[PDB]
Design a protein around this motif. Structure first.
Motif, short mmCIF file in Angstrom:
data_model
loop_
_atom_site.label_atom_id
_atom_site.label_comp_id
_atom_site.label_asym_id
_atom_site.label_seq_id
_atom_site.Cartn_x
_atom_site.Cartn_y
_atom_site.Cartn_z
N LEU A 91 -5.91 -8.36 2.45
CA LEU A 91 -6.81 -9.47 1.80
C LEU A 91 -7.95 -8.86 0.64
O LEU A 91 -8.18 -9.63 -0.34
CB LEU A 91 -6.93 -10.61 2.85
N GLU A 92 -8.64 -8.07 1.42
CA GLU A 92 -9.66 -7.54 0.60
C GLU A 92 -9.39 -6.33 -0.49
O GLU A 92 -10.39 -6.09 -1.28
CB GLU A 92 -10.68 -6.99 1.76
N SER A 93 -7.91 -6.10 -0.68
CA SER A 93 -7.76 -5.23 -1.60
C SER A 93 -7.67 -5.60 -3.02
O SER A 93 -7.67 -6.76 -3.15
CB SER A 93 -6.63 -4.45 -1.26
N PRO A 94 -7.53 -4.76 -3.99
CA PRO A 94 -7.26 -5.18 -5.49
C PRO A 94 -5.95 -5.42 -5.86
O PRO A 94 -5.74 -5.54 -6.82
CB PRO A 94 -7.89 -3.90 -6.14
N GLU A 95 -5.17 -5.35 -4.76
CA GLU A 95 -3.54 -5.62 -5.17
C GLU A 95 -3.17 -7.19 -4.84
O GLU A 95 -3.88 -7.75 -3.77
CB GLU A 95 -2.44 -4.87 -4.56
N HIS A 96 -2.36 -7.72 -5.72
CA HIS A 96 -1.99 -9.16 -5.27
C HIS A 96 -1.20 -9.41 -3.98
O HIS A 96 -1.59 -9.91 -3.15
CB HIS A 96 -0.90 -9.80 -6.17
N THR A 105 -2.56 -14.29 -1.97
CA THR A 105 -3.60 -15.16 -3.06
C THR A 105 -3.85 -16.42 -2.51
O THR A 105 -5.13 -16.69 -2.72
CB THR A 105 -2.65 -15.13 -4.23
#
Lengths: 143, 142
Positions: free
Chosen positions: A42-47, A53
């Motif tokens: 949830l906190e990462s930079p990937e979708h 999302t």
């Protein structure tokens, strides 16, 4: 615009509605689970996925709704008015977010097809009159 | 948790809140723009993209806040104060929704990477002493 938050995920608000309101865990427990299982994703930079999302936005949206509900609460002098609001929420947006959070979190856990299958199954079960309608409602499982 | 709703999109809360507020059109204008340009994609059963998914949630969240605020207004205030809670909402979180709506609607219209460089460039602009910044503030257009 009439947007159904479920539709891009193969469901509709009606499909969710077949379930009795007491089926869903509290919003607090759902958020705890989202943290315990998916916090990093949830906190990462990937979708990661459309559920992540969707989920990211639902989680933050609930923070704005509680701030608003707490604010209204402090601005009502009459305890009966407060009780009216809390009941209204619990039965409206509050259930809505229980359903929505439960859905995305279950889709992540069990897979989207498994949840959609279960929802269709439960919808036909719940709607079969008592006489017929096996004793065992459908199961949701990883298998 | 600590979720930044822009991070999966290559942005941050700060990259946005850094621009002036007057920059962002009102909520009502963004919502009408989203309907006018994207209503079909938005109401459809395809994700279409992560921007579409994020945009749908944002639009539905504002609607949840408005429904809650209007219901309180109509049913627990005198008629003259029907809009009290709506107003509290607009003032408290109106700006943060205006940025979010403007960002996805813009990435949909111009493409994300084009929006990003506009954000980056506005910040570079503004952080330059008004002497090497050709009043040509960069614009998002065409």
């Amino acid at each position: 615009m009439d947007i159904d938050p479920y539709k891009e995920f193969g469901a509709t608000v009606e499909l969710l509605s077949f379930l009795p309101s007491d089926f869903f865990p509290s919003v607090r427990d759902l958020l705890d689970t989202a943290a315990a299982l998916y916090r990093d994703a949830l906190e990462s930079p990937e979708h990661c996925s459309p559920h992540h999302t969707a989920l990211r936005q639902a989680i933050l949206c609930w923070g704005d709704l509680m701030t608003l509900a707490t604010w209204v609460g402090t601005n009502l002098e009459d305890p009966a008015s407060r009780d009216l609001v809390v009941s209204y929420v619990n039965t409206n947006v509050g259930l809505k977010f229980r359903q929505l959070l439960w859905f995305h979190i279950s889709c992540l856990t069990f897979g989207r097809e498994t949840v959609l299958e279960y929802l269709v199954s439960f919808g036909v079960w719940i709607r079969t009159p008592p006489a017929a309608r096996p004793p065992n409602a459908p199961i949701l499982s990883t298998l």
